[PDB]
């Protein structure tokens, strides 16, 4: 997610406002790329955190079994 | 034979090698997100550069018509 949906709704609303106002297409295209960049960065940060959690858990489990 | 095609070919080849070797799916997924992050960054840098070129050109044209 509802966070991802919140971020998407906020972004879409602002982009719709800009498009409605007739903002040059190149500026809108550029803003679409920054949004995609931010969306990719957020997913990558989460993917890394989940991989570190898995690393951290295995170390903890190993330590309890050894 | 582009420089963007070289970056894509290198990436795809390495990803395919990692998949062939049975690298955990989460690591593969993570690397796909970093690549998409890198491709978005490259398209965005170019979009910004083209917007600055347009700004710079209009200023120079205006100065000549001043």
UniProtKB/Swiss-Prot annotation, chains A, B:
Self-associates. Interacts with FSTL3 isoform 2; the interaction enhances MLLT10 in vitro transcriptional activity and self-association. Interacts with YEATS4. Interacts with SS18. Interacts with DOT1L; this interaction also occurs with the KMT2A/MLL1 fusion protein. Interacts with histone H3; interaction is necessary for MLLT10 binding to nucleosomes; interaction is inhibited by histone H3 'Lys-27' methylations (H3K27me1, H3K27me2 and H3K27me3) amd acetylation; interaction stabilizes association of MLLT10 at chromatin; interaction is essential for histone H3 'Lys-79' dimethylation (H3K79me2). It comes from the Eukaryota. It is linked to A chromosomal aberration involving MLLT10 is associated with acute leukemias. Translocation t(10;11)(p12;q23) with KMT2A/MLL1. The result is a rogue activator protein. A chromosomal aberration involving MLLT10 is associated with diffuse histiocytic lymphomas. Translocation t(10;11)(p13;q14) with PICALM. Expressed abundantly in testis. Probably involved in transcriptional regulation. In vitro or as fusion protein with KMT2A/MLL1 has transactivation activity. Binds to cruciform DNA. In cells, binding to unmodified histone H3 regulates DOT1L functions including histone H3 'Lys-79' dimethylation (H3K79me2) and gene activation. It is found in: Nucleus. Residues 1-66 are annotated as: Transactivation domain. Residues 37-65 are annotated as: Leucine-zipper. The chain holds residues 714 to 779 of 1068 of the full protein. This is Protein AF-10.
């Amino acid at each position: 997610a509802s966070i991802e949906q919140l971020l998407e709704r906020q972004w879409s609303e602002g982009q719709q406002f800009l498009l409605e106002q007739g903002t040059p297409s190149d500026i809108l295209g550029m803003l679409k790329s920054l949004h995609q960049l931010q969306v990719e960065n957020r997913r990558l940060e989460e993917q890394i955190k989940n991989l570190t959690a898995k690393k951290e858990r295995l170390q903890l489990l190993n330590a309890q079994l050894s």
